[PDB]
Design a protein around this ligand. Structure first.
Ligand SMILES: [Zn+2]
Ligand SMILES: [Zn+2]
Lengths: 306, 306
């Protein structure tokens, strides 16, 4: 029993981590097989990214302006290519310590674990969601660029995010593992647009099911609703509105608890509409939205495999 | 910038983890050098722990009623001894994958990371505090016994906790790595006393400093106080009262922010005494107490080494 926001174990990743140092400016890369993945602004000492022209900067660099460290050596680089916002760094050896992976483009609302790193060394691991405006609300100090975010199920790591920048208003932006930003963001030091951060409605509902499972089943009430109904309260309070894919994802949670998705929607509104002040759900004074319906089925219910 | 409750990277530990299976009943152990550490109630199928006599149970077992699994094999056990609430399981090989460690008896108020495991395999990692009543507010399903909690600084793992039981009221109890429970608890299935869970006052203060650092410096107010003053509000609201070791631990935080420990105490009271409703601190609607002053200095300030 209990409910914690767990990260995936990070061992499979701590040994894909390396240092990438161009001239100056030191940051992290991901060493898989015989390649190293890193933010292309490693090559920026030029006029900074107050207006950088990456393709013209990158041509002053040769194959061996690029030193990496993996615990202790070099790795010698026998090639490079810029691929949207990522560098690749062809090295001479395959990482003995590479596991099964894919890259994937997570879509907002979903969760991953971040292994925060500084010049190649693990600092910590935390769980996060990609906000509906494709930013993450992270914890990153200077030197953490290139840190990555991953999912696991088997012994198979599904790398999904690479940290690139801190926005001028405290939030974090990055790429998938082939260098396309999430969101409209660019890897320049300019003030970057950023829309409305919505609450991930489907995730809040998963968490209210967790609360019922793990003891706290007394935010429920005696009313019920339609999806059109709830969405007009939803839309109003800055929640992502729900459709039919959400209701079906919630399926077995409604089954193990014996509560219709729609009656759960029904009690959330009274929390969203006329609520405000007092009690407690699974230990939070807020509605949490960084658990997906799968995160819950794990922390309570339905084993995975290993 | 930002502030997250990070766990330590768990790779160093995922490879100290093994399965221990007696007859039936399967749970986790810790495989260090040529020894395996596990809850002694692995040997309980006897009348259950509704009243178990461990020393008489343990004598029906021989050296090789005890099978462990480490990823794939056995480890053959060439000895055993019961040491308070832990088993040891003398095995024939040293874990090739053991790192630098100690055992330590954490004291309430401090934090560690938990690697939640099931029959030898990692599920996840989360950060927690030992509550002042020597329980932890965890997330543990059936089969997680033997999961452990650890601290890191170097490449040196300081194992500090081993999960033993779930109390009848939802909370978790365990031992240090030489088998003495934290708290007055016993490894029997009986209703176990459990005193008042206090808020770790010194940790709340560390977190309010983090909020000032990481943007949120407007819970501060125009008053000040004495330690005797605050403690009488403190005592009243079920906070651990502060002394002089707390004030000094908070030292450099007061230095980087330019705020006297006592003026911080001063604003907390207005939050503790006449407060109630509205705003937001570092994203929480509650006063968080699972960051120690060291956890903060890390997530913001003062690197460690590696
Ligand atoms: Zn970067
Ligand atoms: Zn146990």
């Amino acid at each position: 029993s209990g409910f914690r926001k767990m990260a995936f174990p990070s061992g499979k990743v701590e040994g894909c981590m390396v240092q990438v140092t161009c001239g100056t400016t030191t940051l992290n890369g991901l060493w898989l097989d015989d390649v190293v993945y890193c933010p292309r602004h490693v090559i920026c000492t030029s006029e900074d990214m107050l207006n950088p022209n990456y393709e013209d900067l990158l041509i002053r660099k040769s194959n061996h302006n690029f030193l990496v460290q993996a615990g202790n050596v070099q790795l010698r680089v026998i090639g490079h290519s810029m691929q949207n916002c990522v560098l690749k760094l062809k090295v001479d050896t395959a990482n003995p310590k590479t596991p099964k992976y894919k890259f994937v483009r997570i879509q907002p609302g979903q969760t991953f674990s971040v292994l925060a790193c500084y010049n190649g060394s693990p600092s910590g691991v935390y769980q996060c969601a990609m906000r509906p405006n494709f930013t993450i609300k992270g914890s990153f100090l200077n030197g953490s660029c290139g840190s990555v975010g991953f999912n696991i199920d088997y012994d198979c790591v599904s790398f999904c995010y690479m940290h690139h920048m801190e926005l001028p208003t405290g939030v974090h932006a990055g790429t998938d593992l082939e260098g396309n930003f999430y969101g409209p963001f660019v890897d320049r030091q300019t003030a970057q647009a950023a829309g409305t951060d919505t609450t991930i409605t489907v995730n809040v509902l998963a968490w209210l099911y967790a609360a019922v499972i793990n003891g706290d089943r007394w935010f429920l009430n005696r009313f019920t609703t339609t999806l059109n109904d709830f969405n007009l309260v939803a839309m109003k309070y800055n929640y992502e509105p729900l459709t039919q894919d959400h209701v079906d994802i919630l399926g077995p949670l409604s089954a193990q608890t014996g509560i219709a998705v729609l009656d759960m929607c029904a009690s959330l509104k009274e929390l969203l509409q006329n609520g405000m002040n007092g009690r407690t759900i699974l230990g939070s004074a807020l509605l949490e939205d960084e658990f997906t319906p799968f995160d819950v089925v794990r922390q309570c219910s339905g084993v995975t495999f290993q």
